[PDB]
């Protein structure tokens, strides 16, 4: 009953800026490979769609987990913007912008 | 019944694993069995369980077998040429790269879409029959193919499409394409030089199919 949550917090302090911006380039990246995706099925759909039926449902399932993840890492981006005000604050929304 | 099953059985050992298309060993030795039949029902479906499992298009001595078996009479011989017309939409369907069996609904109208794409000469006749079999109307058609020239500014191709066509179904593809002239000229206009060449192309090839089917509809008093 003494001060214990304060070293759980270092085995999640350990997401540093530099982790923040591969997520948010990983999360870009996802975003174009679904965007280039639905360019190729629209052609699908309109020309030739034989083998895409079940990625349609694939499609609405990794979309719906996508935005789930930029909903939580937008919530995490805002937990710590709050915290550090004046240190971290450039760099946070250099990336919440992306 | 268990020549037939052995038949089977042989088409089924070969032809579900077949990457290459040279294991002829099960057509002489199903031949044999087909000689071997005494009851002349069990000799046409047998055939035609040979047709359901052989790739299209099949070879030189099934096409014998065919050929054979086209000649001769029975009831079951209308179901061989049903199947016979289904080899031939497969073949057409396997040389527009779509090898899927009994597609089931939906998938007509982009397979058209997708043939009148090629701008084969026999493409509209190709996408003709792929309604036909599967019992979907002829207007969709003629509708598509009228449009897909519109597109292109051929209005005179459309023209002489619709002189071809009879009456009945020129009225039914006619009301369509002006009701998608309508609605396509609704949205905002294009101030770009092919947008209103376009438009005007499109009006250009209203007008006289509108005084076409005013021809057609003369004693349609509600319609005219």
Known sequence: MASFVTEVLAHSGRLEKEDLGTRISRLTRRVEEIKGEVCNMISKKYSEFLPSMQSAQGLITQVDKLSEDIDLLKSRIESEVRRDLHVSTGEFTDLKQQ | ?224
Not at chain 2, 106 to 127: F, G, N, T, W
């Open chain 2, 1 to 224: 019944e268990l020549l037939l099953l052995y038949i089977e059985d042989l088409l089924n050992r070969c032809s579900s694993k077949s990457t290459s298309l040279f294991e002829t060993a099960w057509e002489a030795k199903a031949m044999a069995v087909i000689a071997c039949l005494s009851d002349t029902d069990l000799i046409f479906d047998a055939v035609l369980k040979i047709m359901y499992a052989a790739v299209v298009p099949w070879s030189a001595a099934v096409e014998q077998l065919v050929k054979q078996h086209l000649e001769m009479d029975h009831p079951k011989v209308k179901l061989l040429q049903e199947s016979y017309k289904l080899m031939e939409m497969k073949k057409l369907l396997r040389g527009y790269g779509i090898r899927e069996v009994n597609l089931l609904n939906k998938e007509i109208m982009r397979v058209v879409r997708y043939i009148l794409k090629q701008d084969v000469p026999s493409s509209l006749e190709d996408a003709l029959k792929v309604a036909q079999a599967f019992m979907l109307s002829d207007d969709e058609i003629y509708s598509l193919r009228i449009i897909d020239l519109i597109d292109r500014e051929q209005g005179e191709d459309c023209l002489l499409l619709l002189k071809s066509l009879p009456p009945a179904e020129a009225e039914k593809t006619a009301e369509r394409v002006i009701i998608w002239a309508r609605l396509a000229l609704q949205e905002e206009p294009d101030h770009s030089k092919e947008g209103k060449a376009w438009r005007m192309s499109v009006a250009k090839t209203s007008v006289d199919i509108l005084k076409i089917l005013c021809d057609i509809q003369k004693d349609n008093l509600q319609k005219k």
